[PDB]
């Protein structure tokens, strides 16, 4: 996260860290949506151009964390993966369209003050909140600059940007399964996700029921916090039919 600040303890209890076993390192962020399911970006697991194709045994899920590198004894919970599900139409060949994947944990994690699931949006909430100008929040342990890494979870609040502006900022073909966010270069404020933040949540707080909903997944961007550029996020509601299908078909 570039130009964000340290998160408060318990601020994003659904934040998950995707951790590689060998070598031990941070791969991506993710989110807890139930006691047994984790949501992340498909590119975190599969990206053939860079020969990346991680399976269940290559990873560990770390929940309830605040510090990036420290083993938070008695606080975080580490889980093994039972099964990974990548969207069948994930487009890694062209523009990362449908960049989403679900991960089924081996056994349910117990919730606590630091571990709690985020809500997936319904049509009405998505309709009312996903509007240009409205702000959402992104969190993660990714780079602080395009160019080190933070000691603790970072947070930044960014406004959703108008589709035409998103479209006109890149040569890449943008689809209905993506949305972009960030400040325009003339707005004064700045901030953005960066390497390592991918797969993490873009959340919004509903002013109707006071709950946090995950509207997007950190997907891609050109550099980090570059002027006239914006962060791209997977549109979670548009892909909700697939999420629901996988969950009731697999557990």
């Amino acid at each position: 996260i570039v130009e964000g600040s340290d998160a408060e303890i318990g601020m994003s209890p659904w934040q998950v860290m995707l951790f590689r076993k060998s070598p031990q390192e941070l791969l991506c962020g993710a989110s807890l949506i139930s006691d047994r399911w984790v949501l992340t970006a498909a590119h975190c697991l599969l990206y053939p151009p860079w020969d990346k194709n991680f399976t269940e045994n290559d990873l560990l899920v770390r929940i309830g964390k605040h510090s990036r590198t420290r083993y938070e004894r008695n606080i975080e919970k580490i889980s093994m993966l039972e099964k990974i599900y990548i969207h069948p139409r994930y487009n890694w060949r062209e523009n990362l369209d449908r960049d989403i994947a679900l991960m089924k944990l081996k056994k349910p994690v117990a919730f606590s003050d630091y571990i709690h699931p985020v809500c997936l949006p319904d049509r009405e909430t998505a309709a009312s909140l996903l509007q240009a100008g409205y702000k959402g929040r992104v969190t993660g342990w990714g780079n602080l600059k395009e160019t080190g890494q933070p000691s603790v979870l970072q947070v930044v609040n960014l406004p959703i940007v108008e589709r035409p502006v998103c479209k006109d900022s890149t040569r890449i073909r943008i689809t209905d399964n993506m949305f972009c966010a960030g400040y325009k270069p003339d707005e004064g404020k700045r901030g953005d996700a960066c390497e390592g933040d991918s797969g993490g949540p873009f959340v919004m707080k509903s002013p109707f029921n006071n709950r946090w909903y995950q509207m997007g997944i950190v997907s891609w961007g050109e550099g980090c916090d570059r002027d006239g550029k914006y962060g791209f996020y997977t549109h979670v509601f548009r892909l909700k039919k697939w999420i629901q299908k996988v969950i009731d078909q697999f557990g």
């Binding site: 318990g10 601020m11 209890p13 709690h116 929040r137 707080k205 709950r211 946090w212």
Partner: peptide, 28 residues
Amino acid sequence: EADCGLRPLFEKKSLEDKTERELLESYI
């Protein structure tokens, strides 16, 4: 989900985090 999106250390205790007002203030 049933209890989803209500943070133990914040919403459940009626405590606000330091920048959430920024989000709520943008929902015009």
